[PDB]
From a paper:
Src homology 3 (SH3) domain is one of the earliest discovered and widely studied PPI modules, which can recognize a diverse array of the proline-rich motifs (PRMs). Interestingly, although varying in amino acid sequences, the SH3 domains have a conserved architecture containing five antiparallel β-strands (β1–β5) and three defined loops of RT-loop, n-Src-loop, and Distal-loop, as well as a short helix termed as 310, which form a highly conserved hydrophobic groove to recognize PRMs. ASAP1 was reported to play essential roles in both membrane trafficking (e.g., Rab8/11-coated vesicles) and actin cytoskeleton remodeling, which are highly associated with the MyoVa’s functions. Previously, we identified MICAL1, an F-actin disassembly factor, as the binding partner of Myosin Va (MyoVa) by using the globular tail domain (GTD) of MyoVa as the bait in the pulldown experiment coupled with mass spectrum analysis.
To unveil the molecular basis of such a high-affinity interaction between ASAP1 and MICAL1, using a shorter boundary (828–836) of MICAL1-PRM, we determined the crystal structure of ASAP1-SH3 and MICAL1-PRM complex at an atomic resolution of 1.17 Å with high quality. In the complex structure, ASAP1-SH3 adopts a typical SH3 fold to interact with the two crucial prolines of the PxxP core in MICAL1-PRM. In addition to the proline binding, the positively charged residue R835 (position 5) at the C-terminus of MICAL1-PRM packs with the negatively charged patch on ASAP1-SH3, indicating that MICAL1-PRM belongs to the class-II PRM. In the SEM5-SH3 structure, an aromatic residue F165 is located at the center of the hydrophobic pocket and provides hydrophobic contact with a valine (V4) in Sos-PRM, whereas in ASAP1-SH3, this position is replaced by a cysteine, C1096, which has a short sidechain and thereby unlikely contacts with a short-sidechain residue in position 2 of PRMs (e.g., V4 in Sos-PRM). In addition, the positively charged tip of the sidechain of K832 is fixed by the interaction with negatively charged D1099 in ASAP1-SH3, corresponding to a glutamine residue (Q168) in SEM5-SH3. In contrast to the K832E mutant that completely loses the binding to ASAP1-SH3, the K832R mutation mildly enhances the ASAP1/MICAL1 interaction, confirming the requirement of the positively charged residue for the high-affinity recognition.
Numbering used by the authors:
A (entry chain A): 1081 to 1147
B (entry chain C): 824 to 836
The structure:
Amino acid sequence: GPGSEFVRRVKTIYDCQADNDDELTFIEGEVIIVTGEEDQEWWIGHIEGQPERKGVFPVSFVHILSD
Amino acid sequence: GPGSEPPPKPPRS
């Protein structure tokens, strides 16, 4: 999962509207604090500094950010 | 509906 691969924060690389009520909506260029794994294609997290914006999101829609 | 065209998302499980 993201934890085991040392993923703590990521930046979004596309826009994304939730299709289900557990999915995070975001625009490109936002930072997500990654806090878990949904499945092999989806991680879970919240927007850095806006933790009420939270949910699952595609692994392929983000890129790892260094500390 | 003028928004960007993001790539297909993976399916949910």
